[PDB]
Amino acid sequence: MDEGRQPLWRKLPISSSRINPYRIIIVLRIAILCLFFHYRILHPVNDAYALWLTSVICEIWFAVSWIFDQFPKWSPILRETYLDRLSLRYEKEGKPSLLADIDVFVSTVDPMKEPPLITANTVLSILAVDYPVDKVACYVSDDGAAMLTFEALSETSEFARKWVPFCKKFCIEPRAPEWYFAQKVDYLKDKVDATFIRERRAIKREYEEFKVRINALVALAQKVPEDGWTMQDGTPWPGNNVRDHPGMIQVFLGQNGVRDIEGNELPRLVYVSREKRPGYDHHKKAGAMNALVRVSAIITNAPYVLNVDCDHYINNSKALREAMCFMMDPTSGKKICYVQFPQRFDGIDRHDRYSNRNVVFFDINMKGLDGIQGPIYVGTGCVFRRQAFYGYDAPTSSQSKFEKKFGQSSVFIASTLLEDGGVPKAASSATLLKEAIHVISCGYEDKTEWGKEVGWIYGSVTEDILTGFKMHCHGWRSVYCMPKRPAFKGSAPINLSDRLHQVLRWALGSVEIFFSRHCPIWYGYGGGLKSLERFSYINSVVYPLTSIPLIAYCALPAVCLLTGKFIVPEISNYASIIFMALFISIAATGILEMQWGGVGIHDWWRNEQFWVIGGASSHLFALFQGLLKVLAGVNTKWTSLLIPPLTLLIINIIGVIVGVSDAINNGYDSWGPLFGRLFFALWVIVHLYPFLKGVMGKQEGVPTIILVWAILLSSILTLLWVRI
Amino acid sequence: EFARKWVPFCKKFCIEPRAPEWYFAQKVDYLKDKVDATFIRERRAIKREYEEFKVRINALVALAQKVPEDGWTMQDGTPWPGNNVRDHPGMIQVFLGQNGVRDIEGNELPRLVYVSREKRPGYDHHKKAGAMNA
Amino acid sequence: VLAGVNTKWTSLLIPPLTLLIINIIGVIVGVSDAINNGYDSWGPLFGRLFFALWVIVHLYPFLKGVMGKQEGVPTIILVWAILLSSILTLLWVRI
């Protein structure tokens, strides 16, 4: 049929008019880089040989990093989806829906650190998605086993009864009440229903009362009672001890249950808390996700799993349909491991002082990855296929064995064999809660492959990268869905401390992956993994190692300003021409990067600032911790990470002052290369300006101990450099 | 008269600040740290009452802009003693406090006293210092 | 007047962008010629650049829109402007 032959989606290669010059000047800049290195190596500095050697090592490292970064971006593409064809094929009006089932996972660890209002908003947004109510289920994992989360979910389930029909009737976007009622956009735009105003006022008042109720619940649960927590029916709370409690599973909505305001049903909401016992490693988020996968397979057994963070809400209600446009395709859907959505955040400054938007990565590197094998699974907002998580190869590219791979639960083994999802027919519905409690036992993952070859992979802080790499080495492919309206939105870090800690955590995870047996350099040699994807994985693994060449280079001018030497033997016409050509090539290549990627100058400029800041601050301590773990067994706002950048900044300032005094006030005459000498320090201080702005400005603050340490280290370094 | 409604609301709901104009013009989320189940309805009612109070104050200001021909007169027919700014006897009035009138909760309110010191021609009143001493 | 022919309209921005990039190229070339190579008695270059600054000061919004956000032009008009600027520069250098 003509309708059946029309694809549900199609790829849009970057038009040749914008991709041919990109490749041309990539090759050209490679040529000038090689010529520049040939010039630099063969002409050293006689009286400053050590400085020349350090500098040439630094640019060699920089060029290697640039090559490894630029190579994956050879073939960027875009992807376009058609929801009307999906409706024609699977969601035809009148006929029953043929869409596949969906499970959406949310994970929370502490109601004190993560306010229950945000989790309630996320749950409300998920429950109001534009999907059949019987084909979508929501699972919430609570690692803290706190009754506050249970009561917040119980109240959110009662508010959903009123919120979901309103959104479905009036096409409200976004479905999260907090972000919808706080929007400055005209809410009467494109609204045609005659009863919009009264119902909107009523639902706003109801939401305000719900917020007050949630605040009261939070206030009441602030202090633990003497005899532990108790429920509303007199029974004590099983999760009184955070580190010692049995597994708990509760169902709030769905089949049977209770209907909503319009009389229809609502998506099933399940509260799951895995068993915790002393002396057992729970593996934190990876173990929680594995337990959620097992529970969802036991109860609902949807064939696709949505990973949503607690602070991320479904902004676009059509995200599930867009995911199914790829995942339900008869040909591509078999070979797809997951669908990845871009990460967007709200509440960010207009200038994005901390580069929280991160436009450069998600709009250049992700698109380049999508053109070879698929984006790397990062963060949240990912639609995984169950068959990929089970350690199976791509279809289109032995009971004892099953018990050795999945576990000792035969119901889960039976559920794993359902291609289209759903509860297996040869399974009693009455005995389903007991098996779901069994699969979250602390000792279930014994002598099995969970966390090693199937599910989320342990052994690293950033388990997402490891899971994506393990799926990709099997030969699976991934897509990078980029909807017109962003599918998911979250909350950006407020101050610099949280961003620095997050960058340090990412770098530590990358280092741990590098030192483990799952390194892309020497793992995955089966032929399934593509060469360019392997290079991208290596680049994402050994990126923090570029901290050492950075921290030396930023310290190069100040030493020059405190010793009297230059890295260039003598300024010549040939050398000046080579330097100018290299700078022009770099600037032009960046220009076409913006042109094809659609990124403004401000965003990429501040992204470069933040990249330099991160490499100088967090990656250095990441490498220090890695070396300490290699050579020993020691380990650690954290007032130590800011010591290197501030020390280097004031070293550069002192060196600038000393050089100006020495070569102008006293010497003068033929000052010489002092113009570029000061320009280099100006570049360094510009790249590290935000630290000085925070230290000297407002809305910040640094303890005196770290400042004293930095000043003492700077004075010691300056005295040693002057003496030697 | 507006105090008899404003004060119990603030004391019950721990409203900060207590000035209605600055409280109702705050961009901070007013639902933060509020646990009472009847906060929204009472806040809406008190906001409407404060708007009506502002309208009444505006009407009073507009009415008193122009002095009448025979001087000012009170609401009971007696003339205003302070017709002349530089020549009037001292006036003391008590509005709230002990006895008086209770609020919407049945409790009393802090005493409010209106004091106007005597002014006569040829006498130096010393302005704010004299007013404070009086 | 002379015929009977007649016509975002991506032609109106061709003259200003072409003239702006011509001024930028001329500034760069003059700085290279009269400072990097010649130096000595550069002469009235302080005025010669300054006048050009005036132009780039007055036509700054076009550059801000082209390089900034909340704007954008197709590749065809940029290619036409670059080609016209290169042709004009080559003709001026040759003559």
Residue numbers in the entry:
A (entry chain A): 249 to 645, 713 to 951, 972 to 1059
B (entry chain B): 406 to 539
C (entry chain D): 945 to 951, 972 to 1059
Question: How do the authors describe this structure?
Answer:
Of note, compared to GmCesA1 and GmCesA3, the yield of trimeric GmCesA6 was more variable, with some preparations producing primarily monomeric species. This suggests that GmCesA6 is less stable in a detergent-solubilized state compared with the other isoforms. The helix has been modeled for GmCesA1 and GmCesA6, while its density is detectable at a similar position but too discontinuous for modeling in the GmCesA3 map. The displacement of TM helix 7 away from the TM channel of the neighboring subunit opens a lateral lipid-exposed window in the neighboring subunit’s channel architecture. About midway across the membrane, the opening is roughly 6 Å wide, for example between the side chains of Ile901 in TM helix 4 and Trp1018 in TM helix 6. The triangular PCR arrangement in a CesA complex positions the side chains of conserved Lys and Arg residues towards the threefold symmetry axis. These residues include Arg449, Lys452, and Arg453 in GmCesA6 and coordinate unidentified ligand(s) on the membrane distal and proximal side of the PCR triangle. Inactivation could be due to modification of a conserved cysteine residue in CesA’s catalytic pocket (such as Cys558 or Cys630 in GmCesA6). In contrast, the activities of GmCesA1 and GmCesA6 peak at pH 8, with a slight decline at pH 9. GmCesA1’s apparent IC50 for UDP is about 0.8 mM, whereas this concentration is increased to about 1.3–1.5 mM for GmCesA6 and GmCesA3, respectively.
